[PDB]
Design a protein around this ligand. Structure first.
Ligand SMILES: CN(c1ncccc1CNc1ccnc(Nc2ccc3c(c2)CC(=O)N3)n1)S(C)(=O)=O
Length: 256
């Protein structure tokens, strides 16, 4: 029973604007009072809007992983809300931009590794995400990030060529996106292909061009990104190998 009684929720501060409405921080008093994120939905009086909004809760219900945000519950009477576990430090991109000169390279590699464990878990369940990007990752603590959006908010600059050309989204296309996400992390939250028009990305990729090696990115990590960006989907690694390779890279950086 994921249905939460509204009297147990104490709506707090607005922390952002989601695709469906404002997102707030709050308190859920079950177990002692716990920190929660509350997604709201401006137009959920409409059944069509409500179904799309609440699909993220139906999807998240299925998962249990240390690096995937937990669904606490839903309130399906107007105003409709989705209650999730709060990642108190917020969005990964802003976190990386603000903490750029204080975070060590070991921390950036650790974030890529933790995301790879969540994605290996989703791969083990045959779940295809379709929207892997640093904008969908949240920060729980200085040493913990979580995949935090399954709403499906066109992200051309992150998409695998087969996704752009044929609308095909598979486990291999998620690996291409994860490569872009790793580039974003190592770039301290800079977006891929800044200044380039969406319809021109396609052409550069076809021409064999890829995102350049971020400054101070270990060459082993960049080589791993280039493997995620094989044009042929069948040539991209799976998450079991990405996770193992990232663990080695992380330990090599920790040793210095
Ligand atoms: C930012 N938003 C998001 N972006 C990406 C993914 C998910 C969310 C909102 N959902 C969740 C779920 C769990 N924890 C948090 N934590 C949090 C998110 C912002 C912030 C603080 C915590 C503290 C703060 O200042 N900002 N948010 S958004 C654009 O509004 O949908």
């Amino acid at each position: 029973d994921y249905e939460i009684q509204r009297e147990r929720i104490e709506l707090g501060r607005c922390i952002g604007e989601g695709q469906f409405g404002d997102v707030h921080q709050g308190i859920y008093m079950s177990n002692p009072a716990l920190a929660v994120a509350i997604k709201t939905c401006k137009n959920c009086t409409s059944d069509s809007v409500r179904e799309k909004f609440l699909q993220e809760a139906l999807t998240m219900r299925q998962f249990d992983h240390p690096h995937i945000v937990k669904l606490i519950g839903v309130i399906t009477e107007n105003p409709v809300w989705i209650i999730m576990e709060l990642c108190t430090l917020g969005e990964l991109r802003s976190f990386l931009q603000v903490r750029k000169y204080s975070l060590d390279l070991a921390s950036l590699i650790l974030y890529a590794y933790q995301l790879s464990t969540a994605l290996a878990y989703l791969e083990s369940k045959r779940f295809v995400h379709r929207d892997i990007a640093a904008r969908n990752v949240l920060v729980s603590s200085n040493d913990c990030v979580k995949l935090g959006d399954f709403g499906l908010s066109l992200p051309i600059k992150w998409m695998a060529p087969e996704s752009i050309n044929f609308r095909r989204f598979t486990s291999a296309s998620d690996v291409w996106m994860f490569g872009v996400c790793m580039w974003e992390i190592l770039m301290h939250g800079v977006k891929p292909f800044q200044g380039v028009k969406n319809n021109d990305v396609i052409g550069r990729i076809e021409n064999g061009e890829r995102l350049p090696m971020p400054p101070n990115c270990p060459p082993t990590l960049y080589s791993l990104m280039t493997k995620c960006w094989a044009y042929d989907p069948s040539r991209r690694p799976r998450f079991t190998e990405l996770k193992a390779q990232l663990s080695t890279i992380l330990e090599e950086e920790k040793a210095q």
